[model samples]
Target chain A: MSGPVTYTHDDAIGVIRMDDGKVNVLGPTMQQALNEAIDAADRDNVGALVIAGNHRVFSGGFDLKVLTSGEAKPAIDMLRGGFELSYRLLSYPKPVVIACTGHAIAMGAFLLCSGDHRVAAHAYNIQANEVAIGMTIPYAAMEVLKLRLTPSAYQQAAGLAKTFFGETALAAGFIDEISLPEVVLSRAEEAAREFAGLNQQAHNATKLRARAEALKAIRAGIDGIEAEFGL
Target chain B: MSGPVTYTHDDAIGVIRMDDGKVNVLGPTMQQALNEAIDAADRDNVGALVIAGNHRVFSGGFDLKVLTSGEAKPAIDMLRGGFELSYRLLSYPKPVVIACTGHAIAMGAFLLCSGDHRVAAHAYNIQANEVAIGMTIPYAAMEVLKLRLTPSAYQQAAGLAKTFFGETALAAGFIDEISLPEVVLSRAEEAAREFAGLNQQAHNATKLRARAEALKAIRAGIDGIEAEFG
Candidate 1:
């Protein structure tokens, strides 16, 4: 079968599209595909990257089948890969924008926050639903969620697993702008084009400086998890 | 001469009042005095603590006289004391409420954010003005500032040193409520009394858990500063 992720570049902006023909599940296959696509975009030397999803759903999170297979090893591997991807996006050299075409939950929501900017369609559910689902949020994912959210929203999103949509999501710092479902990708591309105008070296340096504390915590959290599982 | 800090208790709440008969500049003396008052409040076994300021000014921040003094050792020591006090307040077992009577700038703003809840009088300036004043904010104070502010507010307050007032301050998460000049202290006491009803151990434990990352960053920041200066 074809990979779920595809990379395309036009002029200065490169696009990474994640479409699994359904709700995109961030399993091992999809995660590896995404990393490969990111590598391709980097090789292309694009000025900016836009991570887009299908029209119906950005992502519904990790693959439940693998997660519930009654096996421990694969589950740990998948969880590590997902959080590592988040850390990668957070520390990516070029500006990254998320085109959240639809509902983004759990890992999906985390990926959204990893981007420098995000555009979402009106009325789509966006949330970190771990607490509601009776699973504690991994510390690395929690650190990413802190990137843009208000203090109150961070507490609500993590503690109560609150779901935000449209204007509410914007106010809570989940997404920077809201676009029509049909135009979400186009708007995201525009954002990428805008980012391309920035001084790339300065942007990268400032991003590293601005996110130093968060990066430290995320790395520590991921390392701790790996140590616990002997990964 | 009397110290700038005073302690009083009534019922389940204790009040620590800072009145230096001026803008309440937070110098070494004031910092030491405030710590003593906090110790006194702990000894009184108050369920909550309300930190209040004089009528015209909450604080204008660190004593400029000492900050610009031609002595490095004293300045570093004062800065360390100020940050340590902020860390103490953040980890204090009881809920601490701040009654900001007037303008709170620099260290004053940092202390306001260190509290569990805060109330400020209407039309008073509140800001982390270090950037505008050509000084970098110490990491420990920055972590406290992060505890309550919106992400955007934090960037502006630290980077641009943007000042907020009254209702605007509330929206930015600097204070929980805005009060009239006459009732700022009274309203802060009410907030402390409300906190007294929560299960004490649960509140303390949850606070530690919720604030774990911030506390970790704060301690690291202080230590880094100390190491750099040494």
Candidate 2:
């Protein structure tokens, strides 16, 4: 089943809220919901998009059971969809902001990197679990990661799979701002308005140029990664 | 007339000490001395190399006297030689440790990035002041700066050219360890031995891979920068 996301339009801003229990498990359905939500936001010509999640848990990551259970077909579909969702935000014509509520791990953590600007509560946790969980970090993720993270964070978060919390996460480039949990979403909404109000064309054009290299690498290789892993 | 740098052996460590006054002033002669010292260390086949400076300052940066005094040929040679030195240590065959004695600026700061490991006194200052001083950071130096610095530092030190010191410098990826001024060299000596004892082939191989892209970018762009700037 897909993750539950409620889409709303606040005038020029489009806000997508993910409410999938305590720790949102991003399966194929959830990824599909996310992609569709972005499309809806784009269709509505929202000036900015903000993706928020349930309090205390932004997303814990992909459905590991489907992944490690050797269900290769479903896994491939889910993984591909998730990566596409990530890349979509990475290259979105409009600014994307993530109101990360709490813990974000694995793909959930990667999603945090997808946003143009990210906000989180002061008590949140972020981690890249691929290396710790016995898998090499996917190249698609690394492309976004290197661009999004500070060099030290790239080493710790991507290479060593170190976990970060709050201010450390800020230092590591997981999020740009930190607020009290109560104000996190509000902060993101404010950011969305600001980003949406920017020169829409220039904003989009800047993204294309800034992300040119990594986007190229991601689109070039995401397909092959699904086919070749651990083979 | 190279600035004085003494090469000596201490156990398995080859120590290159720079003592050309408070700011070693990276002029050609000094750069020449520095390069010759490293070569001498390599020829001696020391397990590790430690580059140290006087107690008050490592080197203030390039000898502005020479660069600004209209000696164009020597100035170009000095600048080119400095970039080569920075890249050399960056991709050195053996692990090299820098014992940053004190304040380091401009090219002096770039030299810090060249070493495999760095140690400095707790009261030292480091800055990539080229931008603040009106010279854009050279393309060659930036290649190493990007690879060697923390992300915050990549912006603050390389782009914004903020100055840092001791712990701040450490946080910025300029130096790894901070020690008392008296003990800085000893700390670097210890690190030199430790890094040198690492598998020679493994250590060298890691350097190549870690630096492969940035190094390639530097080589590809340096000549263009020479043309574009001034």
Candidate 3:
């Protein structure tokens, strides 16, 4: 499979655009594609990375079709793969910026929250929707959410499964800034360029130290999930 | 010395009031007294614990005179004692609420952030002033701060050493609620009563699990501090 991501670079900045001709459902293929794109970007000596979504859909979350496919193996793989991507982005040595072009729910939201700098389109919905849908949020995603949100936002998002958009989401710490739908990618690109200007050694060192606790929790969470699945 | 904390109980609730007839300095005596008061409450089977301060002062931070006394031993003891008390409060079985009646600076700010629910006076200052004063915030205190504050406030308070008060402090997540100076204690007591109605077993279990990551980090942070001193 060719994959759902398109990797392009300019001025030492890498952009990974996800477009599946629909709301990007993070199924196995999409996940694998994203991983490959990240690998390519890193190997290309890209100074910073911007992960963007097509207009009208950043992601609708993990593929419910696969999750409900009645097969244990793919469902477990898909779930584990999503969290692993989040962990990778959070611990990435170079800054990973996000261009949230549209609605981001559940795992999509968690992945967006993992980035170093996030810019979202003004009208798209953003939420960690596990509780409202009657599924407990995974522990690893919880650690990611905690690192980015205010205490009030974390409680509301994780416990109540509250949804937010636009400026409200900004105040809630879901994204660093919001822009017109048309400019979100450019904004993210600009952000990545800004981050690329920093000394990579210093940025990577500080990020690791600052997020030490969350990193440990997220790793343990992934391990716990794997054990729970008998992996 | 009698120490600076008073242990009292009413209506199945415990109150530990710190009053040194001045800005309550978190010295060795105060820490020991606070710990004993908590011991009394646990033994007495109080439903909730409210830690309050004198009318004019919640705390002004560590005993600075002792910290700068040019003797390392007492300074180290005082520093370690403060964080230990904060860890105790965070892991306490019953609800531990705070009545922040006045200025809470540096370690004082970190200590208040460890409580289950915090109520503060309208006009008193609250801050983590370490970076402003050329001191790196202790790791244990940083963990405590992270648990309670918004990412924005954490950056401003930890990195910029910014100060806040009143509604602004509430918005920053330094205090859950704010009241007139006179009613700050009453508000905290009311908060304790509210928490007291929770199923004790459920509250304790959930608190431990919900705060597991932070608790782990805090313990490690304390260990790191001890090693740094040595």
lDDT of all the models against the reference? 0.84, 0.79, 0.84
Report clash pairs, candidate 1: none
Q: What is the model-wide C-alpha lDDT for candidate 2?
A: 0.79
What docking grade does candidate 1 earn? incorrect
Tens-place lDDT digits, model 2, residues A72-168: 8887777777777888888887778899987899989988888877889777889988988887778887876787678667888988999988889
Cα misplacement distance, residue B107 of candidate 2 (Å):
1.3
Off by over 4 Å in 3: A226-231, B1-148, B152-230
Give the clashing residue pairs of candidate 3, or none.
none
Q: After superposition, how far is residue B85 of candidate 1 from its true place, in Å?
A: 1.1
Give the alpha carbon lDDT tens digit for every residue of B23-63 in model 2. Answer: 78888778889899988878888888888888778888888
Candidate 3 docking band:
incorrect
TM-score for candidate 2: 0.58
Chain B TM-scores per candidate, in order, are 0.96, 0.93, 0.95
Higher-TM-score candidate of 1 and 3: 1
Q: Which residue runs does candidate 1 get wrong by more than 4 Å?
A: A1-146, A151-170, A174-210, A214-231, B227-230
Each model's TM-score, in the order given? 0.58, 0.58, 0.57
